[PDB]
Symmetry: C3
Subunit: 121 residues, 3 copies
């Protein structure tokens, strides 16, 4: 299970949401063997005055937070991150300079999905 939040300037979301959505999901399919339908994304559309970051990232600075189950090795997580960079550059033509990713991890017993404790599925 992966829950994804994508924070960006409003205009970046307007223009790129669809392209980002597919790029991110393709990374998860490729790396983690997710089913095509298992896509869960929240785009957090910020007014620029509320999104403050260094001038060496462009108007298309994007922060991706992926909340996942614990357990993947550091090397597997690094590869996932590289694939997200790649897919976003290739499909969105946003430079890796403008993309930032953080993975958060929690044990399965911390999740409820479809009325079930996730450890029980």
């Amino acid at each position: 299970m992966s829950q994804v939040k994508i924070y960006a300037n409003e205009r970046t979301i307007i223009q790129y949401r669809e392209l980002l959505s597919h790029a991110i999901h393709q990374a998860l399919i490729e790396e983690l063997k997710y089913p095509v339908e298992k896509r869960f994304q929240r785009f957090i559309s910020l007014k620029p005055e509320n999104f403050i970051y260094p001038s060496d990232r462009s108007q298309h600075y994007i922060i991706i937070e992926l909340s996942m189950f614990a357990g993947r090795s550091p090397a597997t997580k690094k590869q996932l991150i590289q694939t997200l960079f790649r897919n976003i550059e290739e499909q969105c033509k946003i430079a890796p300079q403008d993309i930032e990713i953080t993975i958060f991890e929690t044990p399965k017993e911390n999740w409820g999905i479809r009325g079930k404790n996730a450890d029980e599925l």
Copy 2:
């Protein structure tokens, strides 16, 4: 201490915010013995175009993120999650299919509350 974020489509928040607020808080009172006043909730109201998830969850798909102190056992956390499901179904008549929960945990030394380091209280 529990900080709760509730992400949903705008219309779901409009119609259900009050009912969800009470249902969630009642779960915390029941399970964790919280005082009635110790309710801290942020409803994150999303335009549907920014909230992308599978078609087997309805317009009332809700994601609840509960940030709490570390230490509760896996079994206690699972029970908490079940009580949230129950209370939301009973009080909101939203099906468990549409409810998703993730607990995040941090040590007390990671928190500041009312000007104090939380470990010191």
Copy 3:
């Protein structure tokens, strides 16, 4: 690396965003020796009806979430929190009663920055 999210009522953000931005960043410079430019802040502007908390915090209740790399000692984290309280009180004249802070920690291998795996920098 520190990613900061600041949640507040809309009017609190309007009046205090600049003052909070400097106060928080100064705390990070002072405590963690951050460069002056390494400021990354997202202000999450909430309508009051969506921001529910006890009546003993004022209209200027602010929640600061700082996502950082793992490894700092509990004592170093507590000091950081105290400095944030101080700077916000001194520079914003918001009482510590109204300020809440939580630090989240993840290993470096969980981050992508400027196209790089953060552990590799």
